[PDB]
Amino acid sequence: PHRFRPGTVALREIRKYQKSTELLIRKLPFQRLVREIAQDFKTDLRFQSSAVAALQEAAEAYLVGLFEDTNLCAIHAKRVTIMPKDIQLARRIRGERA
Amino acid sequence: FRPGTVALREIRKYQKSTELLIRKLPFQRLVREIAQDFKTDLRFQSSAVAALQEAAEAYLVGLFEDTNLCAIHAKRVTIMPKDIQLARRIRGE
Amino acid sequence: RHRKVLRDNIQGITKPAIRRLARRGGVKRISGLIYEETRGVLKIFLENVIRDAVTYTEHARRKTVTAMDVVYALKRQGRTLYGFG
Amino acid sequence: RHRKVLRDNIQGITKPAIRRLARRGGVKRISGLIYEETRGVLKIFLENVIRDAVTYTEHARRKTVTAMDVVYALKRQGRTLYGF
Amino acid sequence: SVETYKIYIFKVLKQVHPDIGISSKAMGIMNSFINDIFEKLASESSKLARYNKKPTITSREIQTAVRLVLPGELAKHAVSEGTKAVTKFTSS
Amino acid sequence: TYKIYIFKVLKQVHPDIGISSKAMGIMNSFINDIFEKLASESSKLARYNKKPTITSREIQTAVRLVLPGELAKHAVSEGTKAVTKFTSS
Amino acid sequence: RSSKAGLQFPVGRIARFLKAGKYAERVGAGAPVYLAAVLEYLAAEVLELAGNAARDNKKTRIVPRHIQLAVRNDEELSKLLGDVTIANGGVMPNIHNLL
Amino acid sequence: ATSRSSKAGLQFPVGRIARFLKAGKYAERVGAGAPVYLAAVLEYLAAEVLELAGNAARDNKKTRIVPRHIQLAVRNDEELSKLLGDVTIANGGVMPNIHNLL
Amino acid sequence: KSYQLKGVKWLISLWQNGLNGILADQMGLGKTIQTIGFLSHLKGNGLDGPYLVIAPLSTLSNWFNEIARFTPSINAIIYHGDKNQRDELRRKHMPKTVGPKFPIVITSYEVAMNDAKRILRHYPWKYVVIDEGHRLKNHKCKLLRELKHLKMDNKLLLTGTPLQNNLSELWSLLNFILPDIFTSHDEFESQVVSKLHGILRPFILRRMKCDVELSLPRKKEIIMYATMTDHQKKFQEHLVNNTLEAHLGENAIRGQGWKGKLNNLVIQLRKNCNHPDLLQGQIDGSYLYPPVEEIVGQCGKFRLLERLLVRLFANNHKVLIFSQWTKLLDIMDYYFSEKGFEVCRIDGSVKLDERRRQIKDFSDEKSSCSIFLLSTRAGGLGINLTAADTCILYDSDWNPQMDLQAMDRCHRIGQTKPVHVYRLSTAQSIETRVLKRAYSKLKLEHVVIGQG
Amino acid sequence: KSYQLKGVKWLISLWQNGLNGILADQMGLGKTIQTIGFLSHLKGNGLDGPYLVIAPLSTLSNWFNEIARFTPSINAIIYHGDKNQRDELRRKHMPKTVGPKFPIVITSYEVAMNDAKRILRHYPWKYVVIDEGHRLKNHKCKLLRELKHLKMDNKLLLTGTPLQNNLSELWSLLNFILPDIFTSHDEFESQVVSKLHGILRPFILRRMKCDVELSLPRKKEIIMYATMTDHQKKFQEHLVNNTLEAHLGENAIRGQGWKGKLNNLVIQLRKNCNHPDLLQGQIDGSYLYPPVEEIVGQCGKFRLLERLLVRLFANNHKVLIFSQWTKLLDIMDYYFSEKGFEVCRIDGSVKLDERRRQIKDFSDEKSSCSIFLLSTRAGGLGINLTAADTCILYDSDWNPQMDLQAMDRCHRIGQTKPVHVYRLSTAQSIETRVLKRAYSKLKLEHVVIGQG
DNA sequence: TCGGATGTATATATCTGACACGTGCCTGGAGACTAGGGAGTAATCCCCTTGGGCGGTTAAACGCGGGGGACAGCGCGTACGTGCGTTTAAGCGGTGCTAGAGCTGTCTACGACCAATTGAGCGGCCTCGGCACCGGGATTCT
DNA sequence: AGAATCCCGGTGCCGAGGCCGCTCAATTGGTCGTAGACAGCTCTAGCACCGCTTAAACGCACGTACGCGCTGTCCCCCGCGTTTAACCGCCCAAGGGGATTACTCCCTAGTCTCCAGGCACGTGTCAGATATATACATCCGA
Ligand SMILES: Nc1ncnc2c1ncn2[C@@H]1O[C@H](COP(=O)(O)OP(=O)(O)O)[C@@H](O)[C@H]1O
Ligand SMILES: Nc1ncnc2c1ncn2[C@@H]1O[C@H](COP(=O)(O)OP(=O)(O)O)[C@@H](O)[C@H]1O
Ligand code: BEF
Ligand code: BEF
């Protein structure tokens, strides 16, 4: 058996996913999610197929932006691991809900 | 008194008041020098310099109280210039 | 007794996909409690945007959320998006 | 030899004032390197606002910065100011 | 020469707290708040009429300006009260 | 759309580079966004002074307010050069 | 006019303001009525909270501090006035992990 | 019948800009130099972004600009990254950034 | 077999003029035999060449079986699966060298479509034969695009129902089977009936169930309505009006505020008319199947099935059951399995080789698994069940020709016992609307038959 | 002293009718030596009741000194300073009980204004006496508001120049010294000259320098212009056009891009005409004072001062120097101190008791500190310098009466040697503009004197 | 420090499906007159920002203990990364069915424009008490 | 101990509330184009269920290295007291500057008349994609 040391296959993933431009969530569960969410405000709705695409591509650019600064909170605290504390700090000094 | 006990006196005293914490004349002199590099021979209304100080002090107080969340997140009580930079990094400035 | 039993659509955002998003964000290690925090902070974002989009739709007397309703809802909340009209 | 030697206006914001601001922020201990960092972020913030408040004044052909130019300059930057 | 909302806010305050009065600084704060909200709702109504192709600002798009500008539980009351007035205005 | 004109400008700076169908959509969106930012800033500038006309001084102040420093400094010169050539020539 | 509607705000002045600012070409008849009702509602909800904060301090006249406290307690108003600074308005008292 | 653009020496449509300024009624009247000024500014900004994007495409040894190149050019430059601070170019991606062991 | 000898006389003829043909032989008449007969007629006269057969998954198996029983030795091979198909590709025979060992290539519509590249390389195919022509009845289907990449010097189409929906399916096929008379201009047929019979006499070849053999006993297709019970009426109104998601939401054990399924009320009314449990079990999101196990009797159509079946066990002749969905067949299975009946079932969810052995067991006369659940498209095409004798179509719609192909499954050369068909339905209901639509579609079908 | 005996005859009279008066006695005589005489006239028998005296800091000292030398025993006390004033307040004497030990209360305008509360409590003051009436020439000055809180049953005003600027200062005083003359209607004076002399004969009491006794030989006020040198002309043009902040910025050792001091030119071109170093010292930090020490000769007005002074050392009679600012006196001191002359100086920056002893030393005839720098408002009011003999006004403006009060400083009862005055100035310059304005102000002053 | 497992990095091809003209009109340009007024460029009175001073009096600056908080190091053990063998399930083809978006045609009601009123509000008169504002003593405190 | 603090009597005074004479705003009544809502026809997408592939998700086992706690050292920040100098300051003065109103012009409205653009649709020509192949470069463990 030939194993890699912990954290070397993670760094080639960072390089892999920071060169591509693809859309990283499965398309059907995301649509079911947005339909479930919209099922409250109005019932029996229809979604133009290019609107769920706009939603998905607006929602991942938000999570990618939140992760790259919950990772500044972890390095400020002398770590390399992210916990929910970092997300809450980042969201609270952004005012996302404060 | 022991180190750290008349500080909390100051946190309590200054969070009740409403008055201005920077002296007026040096602040006026500063805002006048940092406008000489946009437009020479400029005058200010007296209410224009009172409005700049109200906004600047509010900005600094608001920045100090999330600079303090970063220091506590790192398990400290002392604010360091590293904390201000983390706070401004995420707010976008 | 047999039947199907469905799963919370929010559970359809799987752990591998969240790890992929974190990798694109630059993260090296993930704690095991991140996933239920991310699942909850995605729902809030979607609720806000969809609540604005449906309001735009119902103003037009339409029954189909379209692609400007979304782009207008996004531009209103500080999030300008290029590439959809 | 015995003449007027001036100082950078930047200093008129004194260490006690910065400590009062930090105390109203909730801070308990302050390092000694905070003062020159605060004194530098304040200038950046202030010269971002004065630059727009003077542009709003040059348009109107005035020579006096009024309290309304400053309010508009602050509203341009996402912060609203009630009461003037 | 200078028109404000002083009379109307004062009358509303006497309607809410019959005995409390208000100073001048707070009165200015309240005047500014009303101007801010008016500007917000009006600009959103104009822009939202512009998204559709209509040159008229009716009441039903003061509805949706309110639903976009006001948050949650605040709007659900305001909207209701608005409808109230309009009914009492027309079936009068 | 502005696509025609956008293409012209490209053939002035890179006579041998082309553009993908999606990149032209991006450029169209960018032009439409900037135009509306500038035209609304000019509207506010005119309303704050109670004037009913948007001349080429409202556009200049809108450019100074909207574009970042070094970018605005060059946009102003381009525009004033255009207006001078328009009226004089 | 604006006595037939049960409002306390001026519908006529609101309409003058709406037609002066040239937000559109034509202004309907229910628009100033609607906009004047939703302004007195917000004024009435801020003033009640401010008066309540006045009553606790054993005061009979509201001051800017009372508006500040009333806005920063309630969740909806603080969300609406999230970037406003009430002049001469202090801060909401709070201390973190210490005596 | 010379067009306004040729008189102004531009490549953008001065007349179509003037119509767009009228429609929407941003105000009541519109001067004769406003659309010329606005078109000149729009052309300037377009040429700025397109030049940076073309350089980025040559750097990647290509000859056709795609969204990735616009993303690279915008988020490398200073003033453009300030201006387009909070915009999402679609089908672009973030630039490489690894910090510390992470 | 005489007809089948006229079936091989006409495909040897087609081979001659260099023409292509649509073998629309009656379904249930032995079309497949004839095919391997033509394939032996050529197999040994210097007609060695790349030969390719494409068909539905279910039939591929039956075909191999038939080869193993009718023809003494036809080099043949079933190219089914992926990655495991790569080895047999070469342990098949030389790459392009065609010898007396080059084995007949049998593939599926997926395989053919997904990896045409592999077979694209092969020589002009002597004869590509497509078992179910109905698959290509759309002229924009991706299979058709990928099927043109093949270099084919001859084509052939097997079917039993050439036209089902309208004339445009006839149009798309023609262009394919025969690019010669394509006429991509809406066609000129639209007196004219005779003019169409001039173009179509040359290729189309159809027979009939009556043919000559008195061996074929006749069948009886009879509609036996049922009366919608009270509870179903309550469910139907709460939908015709509304607040069903809530009146039933009164329980809503799961998925609180269950999404108003107020889409195509018709469908959400057909599901009711099938069995109300379908609409109940989602709103409530409960786990336990019918609690009393008898509430199943609340469904009127269920109760008419039960009594029919008790009277048909009085004789024991094996039955056949068809449905449109698979949730409903599942309810049925639950119900009967509680009583204890042994059932066999082949829907689309079940695997291929798994379903092939189930038949091989159902076909075992000694075994007493009389009941046989079977969904329409699931396995209503290509399966011999001479063992069974009666077909019950619980529900079927939108295309009448879909149903027929099933009835024949039971009724096919070798079925000695006379066949009945029981198209159940509910009187004065959404079902009758569909029934009438189907009659309309048939009306068109009978105008087509007069054409014949 | 006869005049001073008519000075005490008229304030005993004022005491009688119950009237209030403006002792506008000529400056440089009597006044002080007249006030304490009236104060002994009443301290005898009439006592002091609560008696309060307010005056400029410089005079308070001279007054104590005079008391210590003219009156044998007048309980008196100088209430100067803060916090240390609290102890002497009670170690003064009983609180309100006025006895033969109740000491005369001497305060300053700051003390009086800042803590009137303390003295507000005291009884109706028998006589409040304000040394320099000019302090109250504005009717909105905060001192006046705080001076009314005192319960005063009598008022008195000492001055030597009642009106300086215009008639409204006469208006504000009247209302104060005598509220019987409220006349808060712009006054009715505006032939009329005689009508004004009817109102003012009753209170105002003015005498002259000539009076009767020869005493002080006539003085001579003479204007000796100077020719602006080349360098000053260069500075003036770069100021009148522009780019001075930059041409001089060519050096700009400190404060890079030094703020354009383009404040109407008036605030600057005079500074040039005083000495160009003032401008150079700011645009460029120049920590070192003109090191050449002959660059001071570039100033034409400086060179005319130097030669004048060399010719006035030929006799050694002590000089007096006045200026408007304190930077310029500083330059002068630097210059002379380099040569070695011993100088004494009292501006507003120096402290009170410190400046009092400096005089006591300057007044020492044996000591050879002949030169005496002195800024106008600094110490141009209340100081006896009989030791000196010549006054040089480097620069003074905006109010001519400001200058006169200085000249008299040297020229006052006891000055035996005849006095000269040298108002230096630069010909054809901004200075002449001011000179003419001053002449205009005097013109008004002489129309006022004709009134007298 | 070598030698090996792979991982990315260069080079062969095909293969789309997109990029690249071409055309043909229709709606928007530009051009020419006329009208009204909206700026433009004056002339005047003022309230108002801009220097000196000058005191002066808390606040700032400086210095000195001395402890308590930051930071480094060390040990333990627990939770997360790597790789492998199933299991869904998304992700594709095919099959249907109205539903709801888009445009046009037609009339009735509704909002801009304009005359003649008149009672709302705004700027400026007074007047009194709810803010403060001071000492002066009982109570916590660490 | 020696240090911290609220409440309760004593203090003014000037800003909030009333009054007001008013004049220009908002109301009532009229007229009238042109927007509304409706109505109808067309027919282009959302969607809705079922059947196959294969790629991705999921579970699992090990092992290790990173998080977290404990201890020690030292340095720098805090609290206190003295002395200096600065902001909140009283006064001085000129020119400024800022919102006022003036005939005057020319510069934007429009109403129209046609040449001109552009946008849509119909075709090819790829070029950057992708897959197989080949080195050239790097983690890894000993
Ligand atoms: N010529 C024949 N010889 C022998 N058996 C036959 C013949 N034709 C039909 N059969 C029997 O009848 C069955 C049904 O015929 P089949 O070829 O399967 O029909 P289909 O045309 O539907 O494929 C066959 O499987 C076989 O058992
Ligand atoms: N009556 C007098 N008796 C003695 N010496 C006098 C008399 N009058 C004036 N002097 C002298 O002349 C000086 C100047 O008079 P003074 O009273 O100081 O003038 P001022 O009126 O300016 O205060 C006195 O200090 C004193 O030396
Ligand atoms: F092969 Be047959 F059509 F069942
Ligand atoms: F006291 Be005097 F006026 F010098």
Element (H or E) spanning J425, and its range?
strand J420-426
Resolution number, Å: 4.1
Give the C-alpha separation, C55 to C60, whole Å: 9
Q: What is the CATH number of the domain that holds A65?
A: 1.10.20.10
How many beta-carbon pairs below 8 A join chains A and I? 11
Q: Which residue has the least CA distance to atom 21 on ligand 1?
A: I30
Q: Please tell me the total count of domains within chain G.
A: 1
Amino acid in position J441: K
CB I103 within 8 A of CB I93: yes
Give the C-alpha separation, C36 to I408, whole Å: 55
- Whose structure tokens read 């008519």? J6
Breaks in chain B (C–N > 2.5 Å) following residue: none
Please report residues of H whose CB lies closer than 8 A to that of A66.
none
> In angstroms, what is the C-alpha Rg of chain B?
17
Amino acid in position C68: M
Residues J63, J64, J69, J70: is their CA dihedral positive or negative? positive
The helices-and-strands tally (H runs, E runs) of chain E is: 4, 2
Question: What is the per-residue DSSP string for I184-217?
Answer: TTT-S---HHHHHHHHHTTT-----SSSS-TTS-
Q: What is the dihedral of CA J163, J168, J170, J172, to 10 degrees?
A: -130
Give the C-alpha separation, B80 to B70, whole Å: 10
Q: Please tell me the total count of domains within chain F.
A: 1
- Annotate chain H with three-state secondary structure: CCCHHHHHCCCCCHHHHHHHHHCCCCCCEECCCHHHHHHHHHHHHHHHHHHHHHHHHHHCCCCEECHHHHHHHHHHCHHHHHHCCCEEECCCCCCCCCCCCC
Whether I30 has a binding-site annotation, put simply, is yes
> Helix, strand or coil for residue C44?
helix
Give the C-alpha separation, C52 to J235, whole Å: 67
CA distances from J342 to J315, J358, J362, J373 (A): 17, 12, 11, 11
In 3-state terms, chain B is what percent helix, strand and coil (to 5)?
65, 5, 30
Whether the CB of B2 is below 8 Å from some CB of chain G: the reply is no
Element (H or E) spanning I436, and its range?
helix I430-451
> Helix, strand or coil for residue J52?
strand
User: For chain H, how long is the longest CA-to-CA vector?
Assistant: 67
Element (H or E) spanning G32, and its range?
helix G30-56
Amino acid in position J201: R
Backbone phi and psi for residue H60, each to the nearest 5 degrees, phi listed first: -85, 15
User: In terms of Cα–Cα distance, which of J332, J354, J351 is closest to J343?
Assistant: J332
CB J344 within 8 A of CB J371: yes
Nearest residue of B to residue A75 by CA position? B74
Question: What is the per-residue DSSP string for J291-344?
Answer: TTSSSGGGSHHHHHHHHHHHHHHTT---EEEEESSSHHHHHHHHHHHHHT--EE
Beta carbons within 10 angstroms of residue I206's beta carbon: 15
**Joined tokens for residue I244:** 């069903």
How many residues are given for chain D? 84
Which residue in E32, E34, E35, E37 has the most chain D C-beta atoms within 10 A of its own C-beta, making it the best mutation to test that interface?
E32
CA distances from D80 to A91, B18, F67, I60 (A): 22, 19, 21, 75
Range of the domain at F30: 3-88
CA D68 to chain centre: 17
User: In terms of Cα–Cα distance, which of G64, G99, G98 is closest to G84?
Assistant: G64
- Whose structure tokens read 């030669």? J307
**Joined tokens for residue A59:** 């929602």
Q: Is residue E1 assigned to a domain?
A: no
Give the C-alpha separation, H52 to J353, whole Å: 75
- Whose structure tokens read 């200075």? J431
Give the C-alpha separation, J159 to J196, whole Å: 19
Q: Calculate how far, in angstroms, residue B66's C-alpha sits from the geometric centre of ligand 3.
A: 76
- Whose structure tokens read 């999402």? H88
**Joined tokens for residue G39:** 């302004």
Element (H or E) spanning A60, and its range?
helix A49-76
Measure, in angstroms, how far nucleotide L68 C1' is from residue J271 CA.
71
Positions of E strands within chain C: 29-30, 64-65, 80-82
Give the C-alpha separation, H97 to J221, whole Å: 84
Helices (H), G1-99: 11-20, 30-56, 64-73, 75-80
- Residues 6+ away with beta carbon under 8 Å from I273: I228, I232, I301, I426, I429, I430, I431
Give the C-alpha separation, I68 to I71, whole Å: 6
Positions of E strands within J120-255: 127-130, 155-158, 220-226
CB G48 within 8 A of CB G77: no
What is the β-pairing status of strands D80-82 and F18-19? unpaired
Range of the domain at G27: 11-80
Give the C-alpha separation, B8 to B2, whole Å: 12
Eight-class DSSP state of J365:
S
CA distances from H84 to C79, F1, F34, H49, H87 (A): 11, 21, 10, 11, 6
Nearest chain G Cα distance for residue D81, angstroms = 6
Give the C-alpha separation, I158 to I180, whole Å: 19
- Whose structure tokens read 């409960």? I286
Give the C-alpha separation, J76 to J67, whole Å: 9
Measure, in angstroms, how far nucleotide L106 C1' is from residue F58 CA.
21
D9-75 — its CATH code?
Answer: 1.10.20.10
Experimental method: cryo-EM
CB J63 within 8 A of CB J106: yes
Atom of ligand 4 nearest to the CA of J158: 3
> Helix, strand or coil for residue J223?
strand
Eight-class DSSP state of J226:
E
Give the C-alpha separation, A34 to C13, whole Å: 12
Q: What is the dihedral of CA E13, E18, E20, E25, to 10 degrees?
A: 20
User: Domain segments of chain C: what residues?
Assistant: 9-76
User: In terms of Cα–Cα distance, which of E76, E22, E70 is closest to G47?
Assistant: E22
Give the C-alpha separation, A37 to A45, whole Å: 11
User: In terms of Cα–Cα distance, which of B16, B88, B64 is closest to D35?
Assistant: B64
- Residues 6+ away with beta carbon under 8 Å from I410: I320, I385, I386, I388, I389, I390, I391, I419
Range of the domain at A77: 48-98
Give the C-alpha separation, F72 to F61, whole Å: 10
CA distances from F1 to F30, G74, H67 (A): 11, 47, 19
CB H56 within 8 A of CB H69: yes
Whether the CB of A7 is below 8 Å from some CB of chain H: the reply is yes
Eight-class DSSP state of J451:
H
Amino acid in position H7: K
Beta carbons within 10 angstroms of residue J201's beta carbon: 9
CATH topology (fold) of I2-200 = Rossmann fold (3.40.50)
C9-76 — its CATH code?
Answer: 1.10.20.10
Helices (H), I241-326: 244-247, 265-274, 277-283, 300-313
Q: What is the dihedral of CA I153, I157, I162, I164, to 10 degrees?
A: -100
Give the C-alpha separation, G4 to F75, whole Å: 55
Give the C-alpha separation, D74 to F38, whole Å: 19
Question: Is the CB of A32 within 7 Å of strand L?
Answer: no
Q: Using a 6 Å cutoff on CB, does residue J318 contact ligand 2? A: no
**N-to-C CA span, chain B:** 40
Give the C-alpha separation, D4 to J237, whole Å: 26
CB G64 within 8 A of CB G88: yes
Backbone phi and psi for residue I363, each to the nearest 5 degrees, phi listed first: -65, -20
Give the C-alpha separation, J267 to J397, whole Å: 12
HSE-up (13 A, CA, CB side) for residue C67: 15
Amino acid in position C65: V
CB H92 within 8 A of CB A21: yes
CB D65 within 8 A of CB D53: yes
Give the C-alpha separation, I60 to J219, whole Å: 140
Whether the CB of C26 is below 8 Å from some CB of chain H: the reply is yes
**Joined tokens for residue E22:** 């208000």
Element (H or E) spanning E13, and its range?
helix E6-16
Buried b or exposed e, range F33-65, using 16+ CB within 10 angstroms: ebbeebbbbbbbbbeeeeeeebbbbbbbbbbbb
> Helix, strand or coil for residue A25?
coil
CB G53 within 8 A of CB D48: no
Which residues partner with E56 through β-bridges?
G26
CATH topology (fold) of J216-229+299-427 = Rossmann fold (3.40.50)
Q: Which nucleotides of strand K are protein-proximal, with an atom < 7 A from a CB?
A: 5-8, 18-20, 28-31, 38-40, 48-61, 65-71, 79-84, 89-102, 110-112, 120-123, 130-132, 142
How many residues are given for chain E? 92
Question: What is the per-residue DSSP string for J241-304?
Answer: SS-HHHHGGGT--SSSS-----STTHHHHHHHHH-THHHHHHHS---S--TTSSSGGGSHHHHH
In 3-state terms, chain A is what percent helix, strand and coil (to 5)?
60, 5, 35
I220-451 — its CATH code?
Answer: 3.40.50.300
Positions of E strands within A1-98: 46-47, 81-82
Nearest residue of D to residue B30 by CA position? D9
Nearest chain G Cα distance for residue E18, angstroms = 10
Nearest residue of D to residue F63 by CA position? D55
**Joined tokens for residue D16:** 């006690």
Nearest chain F Cα distance for residue C11, angstroms = 33
Please report residues of H whose CB lies closer than 8 A to that of F38.
38, 41
In 3-state terms, chain E is what percent helix, strand and coil (to 5)?
75, 5, 20
**Joined tokens for residue A32:** 């079911």
User: Domain segments of chain I: what residues?
Assistant: 2-200, 220-451
Give the C-alpha separation, J161 to J166, whole Å: 12
Give the C-alpha separation, H95 to H70, whole Å: 12
- Whose structure tokens read 């090296």? C28
HSE-up (13 A, CA, CB side) for residue G21: 19
How many residues are given for chain F? 89
CB I375 within 8 A of CB I329: yes
Please report residues of G whose CB lies closer than 8 A to that of B19.
88
Determine whether A69 is exposed, middle or buried from the number of CB atoms within 10 Å of its CB (0-12, 13-18, 19+).
Answer: buried
Amino acid in position I155: K
CB E28 within 8 A of CB E40: no
CB B87 within 8 A of CB A93: yes
Amino acid in position G39: L
Eight-class DSSP state of J125:
B
- Residues 6+ away with beta carbon under 8 Å from C19: C30
Whether the CB of A89 is below 8 Å from some CB of chain C: the reply is no
Whether I228 has a binding-site annotation, put simply, is no
Please report residues of D whose CB lies closer than 8 A to that of J255.
6
- Annotate C19-30 with three-state secondary structure: HHHHHHHCCCEE
Give the C-alpha separation, G68 to B18, whole Å: 11
- Annotate I251-272 with three-state secondary structure: CCCCCCCCCCCCCCHHHHHHHH
Q: What is the CATH number of the domain that holds F16?
A: 1.10.20.10
CA J236 to chain centre: 32
Amino acid in position I137: K
Which residues partner with J391 through β-bridges?
J320, J421
User: In terms of Cα–Cα distance, which of B63, E29, E36, B47 is closest to G87?
Assistant: E29
Q: Please tell me the total count of domains within chain B.
A: 1
Q: What angle do CA D17, D20, D21 make, to 5 degrees?
A: 90
CA–C1' nearest nucleotide, residue E7: K121
Give the C-alpha separation, H87 to E36, whole Å: 27
